[PDB]
């Protein structure tokens, strides 16, 4: 079973599919 476990710093992008980037972030730490 493959795993995607975002339990260490990651980047996340909100985008239009086939299109532009709307927002981009780095998750470094729990707030």
């Amino acid at each position: 079973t493959n795993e995607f476990s975002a339990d260490h710093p990651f980047i996340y992008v909100i985008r239009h599919v086939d299109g532009k980037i709307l927002f981009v972030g780095r998750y470094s730490s729990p707030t």
Partner: protein, 245 residues
């Protein structure tokens, strides 16, 4: 856009004489104002507050200089349900490695056995995986997760629009279990220092030449970006606003 909406507003001091070429390029997003009047900032802030469904408020947190000549603002707003929502039943406390030997509690959302667009990417600056979590409609969240527990910085600093498109294009449907934090974050950024470091050395302050705005000297001394995001089991909500003045 249906999930994403944007607006821009430009405010010029009423005592300045503006050039029509500039005004034509701006469109019907321009008005003149009196920056010596205190309710002026209140009315601009209320505009952004309402547009961003309360999430950016106030954009302008300092009284405005009565000598301001031009204020340019943008605001954007996004809210969409996940195409496949997370089950709260599966959300629980997990260690988050802020560094390889420092663990901080996070509320982790989990989804098992479903299929998502995904790729395993091998690069000289680090190996990683990328997944796409779709929203209802035509947007998605793409997440980039280093294979090494503290491997993000070298990938981050090689993230370009072209790379990102290349990795995203390589994704294919695969069954994979997904674990990602639930989180809310607010940001506030002074963009002047970053943009100077990127080469905008004659944009802010006295070297800035905005002589094509009007018959008078216009200077832009500051530029702020304020943001909000809420990622939870049912939806993502995001907002941002930018001001230069």
């Amino acid at each position: 856009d249906i999930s994403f909406k944007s607006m821009n507003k430009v405010y010029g001091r009423y005592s300045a004489v503006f050039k029509d070429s500039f005004l034509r390029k701006i469109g019907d997003n321009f008005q003149t104002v009196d920056f010596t009047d205190s309710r002026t900032v209140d009315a601009i802030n209320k505009s952004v507050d309402i547009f961003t469904e309360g999430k950016i408020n106030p954009l302008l947190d300092e009284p405005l200089s009565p000598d301001t000549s031009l204020l340019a603002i943008s605001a954007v707003y996004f809210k969409a349900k996940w195409l496949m929502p997370f089950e709260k039943e599966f959300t629980s406390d997990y260690p988050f490695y802020v560094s390889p030997t420092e663990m901080v509690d996070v509320s982790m959302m989990s989804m098992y056995g479903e299929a998502f667009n995904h790729a395993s990417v091998k690069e000289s600056f680090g190996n990683f995986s990328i997944i796409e979590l779709p929203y209802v409609g035509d947007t998605s969240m793409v997440v980039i997760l280093p294979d090494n527990i503290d491997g993000l910085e070298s990938i981050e600093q090689n993230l370009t629009d072209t790379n990102f498109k290349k990795w995203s294009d390589s994704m294919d449907a695969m069954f994979i279990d997904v674990h990602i934090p639930k989180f809310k974050v607010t940001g506030s950024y002074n963009l002047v220092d970053a943009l100077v470091k990127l080469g905008l050395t004659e944009v802010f302050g006295s070297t800035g030449d905005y002589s094509n705005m009007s018959n008078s000297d216009v200077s832009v001394d500051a530029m702020i970006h304020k943001t909000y995001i809420d990622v939870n089991e049912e939806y993502t909500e995001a907002a941002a606003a930018t001001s230069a003045l």
